[PDB]
């Protein structure tokens, strides 16, 4: 039975265009062009400013999110266009995917550790579908409650149930890096 997906697909029209949507997603001044500052500044803002993170999780959170983007060759100072985007996101995708068939934790995986310590209100690496609603729609890469429910139909939710960051990591595994079949929907209609 199939696990999962180590393979890239980079000439996927339907893996650039998640990628394409989620850059003009990001460019809110509509300039072509996105920098590391405002990636981190986004993400820092979200969880200080909406969901209450303490300065120890908001460093731990800040480290992640600069290394997940900077493995996209994202910089501080330095402008990334679209031509500049997709090509460093081929590079950040076989990046993980090594990480993931290493068995080495992934940025994705770091990212959504410190993420879910700030979400998870118990702080066990465990989020409602509420908490999940209220990350989604403060960073504002899901809208409508509707496509925050798609996603705990496609995880697999524990018996709480919740969503933990080994579930969500095996989910962008193939949303993100591979395209997988399987992964679709995950954002509901939010992200083609
Ligand atoms: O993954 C995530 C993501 C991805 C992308 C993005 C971006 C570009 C691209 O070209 C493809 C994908 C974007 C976002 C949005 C964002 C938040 C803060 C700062 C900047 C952007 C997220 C959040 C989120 C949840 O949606 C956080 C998360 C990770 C790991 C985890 O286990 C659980 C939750």
Redesign the pocket.
Known sequence: HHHGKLTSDFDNPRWIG??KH??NF?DVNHNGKISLDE??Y??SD?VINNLGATPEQAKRHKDA?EAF?GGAGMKYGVETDWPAYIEG?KKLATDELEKYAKNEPTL??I??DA??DIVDKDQNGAITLDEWKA??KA?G?IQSSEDCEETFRVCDIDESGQLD?DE??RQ?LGF?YTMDPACEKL?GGAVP
């Open positions: 998640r990628h989620m850059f990001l990636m981190v986004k993400a979200i999110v983007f996101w994705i995986r990212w959504g993420l879910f990350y989604t960073a890469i960051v969500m990591t962008h993100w954002y």
